[PDB]
């Protein structure tokens, strides 16, 4: 009855304001690919995918384009859509880029079911809307830098901001963290994110020393795929170490909570397989007892929380604000869904032209 | 937007055809108690709980009418009621005979969600409507009546049918399979439920005579609670040992499996906590690698199967064919969703007021 | 030779003096339910179960009412009879309400058993009284109330107080433990309950502070049926970790004490399954190495710790004094078995007029 | 010194004589990315990459394509370069597509450092030339086309032959395992695939019913990354669980063998990361005790597996028998590296030209 009727992509390159430098290399702009779901009913639904790497853009673009042919004619049903994607790349690999894609047609088609019975994906999911707290993302600053971006985001608002860390040096992620302290007091919180960048032993020394300044969690201490070493480097602390953003799939997630990886989890949306994998996840957060936060995505994201049963933090930062209109908004230090059907994201048509790949 | 306008409930205790004996006492007719959940959209929706003994139906009923005003007023919206229901019975245990009720409301607010959207609630889950192979569920009928109400099922097409046993001596056990396989065929698949009636001991070497018999599962062989026992009486065993119906709430579901007491699964709609507790349930089996087979509630258990990663059997045991209308269909041993908004649950009036209690 | 002839119940809700507020919610009077156990021996055992809100009292009583039926002229033998009503709600689920009536009925059959033998509880149970330390149970009062309470409690010689928290901020929980400890001194217990109030990570924060500040006990700081997470905050602290009062029957407590959830156990005497219960539970508290008090039902927990191998606190937190005259005293801080047949309820009849439902 | 002077790549769709059908799916022709690694020293590494399904084929080839500057101007040192691109997509996810990419430039990397020195690439990772047993690879091909492809491999002189399974019923695959037991006798080797296509209850079953039939290996029965659930079904059987074709890299073979899901291995030698990641696999698979096969990549898993402790069977799977020269011959059933520098792959340019995409 409701038929997936064509699938259109566009890669775009856009601006952010600040870039991402972390301890690991630097994101200096977003490369973005925005996805139309056209349907039977006349709604077209709307997601994006974040690449990561210029790099990575174009070949993920392909994947969605050759990817068109085996989901038209298809119904709407976003859970019926995953099962026969995940079959479709058994013997590829349902992982990495493949992954990426499907999700970015599940929260395309769970954003048109919203629009064909013209509801919020929050009320749709059966939850009420509720504002999230969010906390602003800023990246390896800097001493002066990180300190102004943190009283800025105060002066907005927000009551917490993760800084990224990582220096030659822990004095140096020491400095950055206290001059922040000092700028907002000791009420803000400071999550700090190392980008898996230290190895087991030189985390537990670092982050033994972060705890005693009082930040709030220790994000990704060391390489993302090793669960076992992030459950040595916990073990050592009273501080939650967080992690989750790169888990490709409630799969990868399950490996890492079964073996108490981390205290805190916060998936992204697009790794762990859109809005169908996001209510996976939350079940499996809930029973082991994780408060779960989300990585990037925070348009659906805030949609997506208000229906997690142990919702703890939004990530605010910004991707793709250059292209679509801000119907999210921020009072207060928390994000409000907008009343519009689906997720609420709508295209700023002619500022994409400007950034097309 | 919309409300929870009011609640009403009717006791009944309708009849059956053939009692249900089991090893451990029979259930003669079915004490049901039929909800109405009014919302201020003019929409109504409908659903039953199963009592399991008259001793239980006033007071069930009792609590229902009791807890009406802390949901009238409320918005029509699961998820956050499911989690507001928890908090407040926080203190007296969420569990028992308070959780039943609470998976009856939440059964009724889905049922109304659908019927607001006008989408079967499997499409409002976010799948496709598929037929789900179903067993005919009789019970401990010695072997005359087991061998006849199974070539019965087999006429009208059923490919499998579930008996129980726990007979004084295992030679009545083996008995009553044996003369059913006879008469129906080595194709057909024979689940047997012990319904908690062995000690350990007792089960392993039941069920090793009855698993070279050839019986498709083995069903609570003991006490239900006790999910080491279980996983030491699978550990004996080639066949899969069965259990589910009986955990109260995904977070006794996460205990069983997480110790491995059995390789399937069979949540009841009612006590794993209602459309809201079977996504959850659905989420854990997935990971587990458990295949998820239904308890009761043929009407809701069909929507739900057909958005469950796992699915695995429906059972077919119409407790409440006398009072609802037959739009749940059977059709060559598949259950067939009805095309109807929310659940298809559609009261027959004048039959209700014969078994009002 | 006794048997039991008749089964009375009135459902009553009487005053408390100081409402119990606690950081999931409020009691303010307390809904009890008072049980006639009448025996052909012309004696009569008298029990009172605790129904927590409001919204489930008719519930229980009803449910008392039509279990009736199946005790009446079974022997007054109430090991015998809990295997019996183990097995008759086999299907339903002997747990929650049902097991807390069934459990009302145990405790009343022993109190009916000890007037048969006019020799008070204790001592049928092979057991000479002893006084059992026991601290003041107050609520979440704030600052002011709760260093008020804590000076009247020690002025009326108990040596302990237990105070409710979980406020918003950590510090307004320190804040009224600093005052109680300013008040009452150094030499004096100050338990904290967090009434199952706080995820696991905020857990680990807050305890560790409170440890520092020198409490007691830290009392089920997150969701009771989390064992597991309960075992991960235990291992984070030296202070124990106590819980037990939500455990409904003695393998709920099995299963928290296997995994290692707690270092004090206060099994309550309704949730436990009464006398019977509390014995299996003494012999598993005995052999995991648990110091182990009670939780409400002073009257009958007197009794029981007395013969408990591992006796710990009794809790004094009068529901009933309103309809039950006044034979268990506090002399030094110490509750006193009174030398009286069974446990020693003699129900106050015109005050209970005043308050029936 | 040697420096990597550009990159070249091109897809192509090429033909295979048997599709290969397997009970999730069929690949009817090979898609591949041929790779041209060009050097400073005037030599060019060769390496094809395997695309599974012509839906990753262009997307595959664009992210080799836009990979190439960070790899051009960079020594020719395949361990240096592995971790430099470990690095780079660190935040993106260095597993899938990536992953796959990076192992096809380490492939070429190492057949280009065999040509710089003029040596086979076995004799350069310190190893002597030696005949791996091969065992030919055929699918999903039913009873009479299974038995026809076993004889005719037993005439080329293989010992053994794999079959795909995962037949509606158990019985079909009986019926073509045991048709061909009979067409080869019992000394040759049947091994069988069952291509992740059951769950694990039924796993265990038709395994242990092909154990009694005497087949050599079962090969992922069910899902490739459920390494738990592998355990289970390899826990009920005497015969050996084969997996290892879809680890992306050693860290994710370590977590299976880790927890034991298999007792033999076959890694893949694009997905488990070039030679640089068989180094690393090949010492794993040694202390775990696994005999280790290859998959797919017969002309440098030639080399590889001589070079390999507990070296096992080489797979044959002629996918790119049309576009390069037949130098790795297969003398009485054992695969003979070619006495060439690097792998020996030579390009069959005009036939090239007739498959490019
Ligand atoms: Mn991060
Ligand atoms: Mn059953
Ligand atoms: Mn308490
Ligand atoms: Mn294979």
Redesign the interface.
Known sequence: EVLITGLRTRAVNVPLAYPVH?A??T?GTAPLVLIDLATSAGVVGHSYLF??????????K??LD??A??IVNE?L????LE?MLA???????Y??????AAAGIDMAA?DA?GKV?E?PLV??????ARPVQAYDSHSLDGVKLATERAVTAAELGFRAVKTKIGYPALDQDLAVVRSIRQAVGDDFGIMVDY??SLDVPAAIKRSQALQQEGVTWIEEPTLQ??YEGHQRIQSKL?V?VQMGE?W?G??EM??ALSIGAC??AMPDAM?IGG??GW??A???A??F???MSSHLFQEISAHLLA?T??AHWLERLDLAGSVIEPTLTFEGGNAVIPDLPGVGIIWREKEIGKYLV
């Open positions: 972390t690991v290399g994101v690449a990561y790497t210029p790099v990575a853009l174009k070949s993920l392909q994947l050759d990817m042919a085996m119904p049903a976003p859970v019926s099962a079959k479709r790349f058994c013997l590829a690999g992982t990495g880029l493949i992954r990426m769970w079911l019975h509801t009320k749709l999911l059966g939850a009420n980008n898996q795929h090793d009273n939650p790169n490709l409630p799969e399950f490996k205290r805190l790794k809005v169908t209510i996976r939350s079940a499996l809930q029973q007892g994780i408060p229906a049963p142990t």
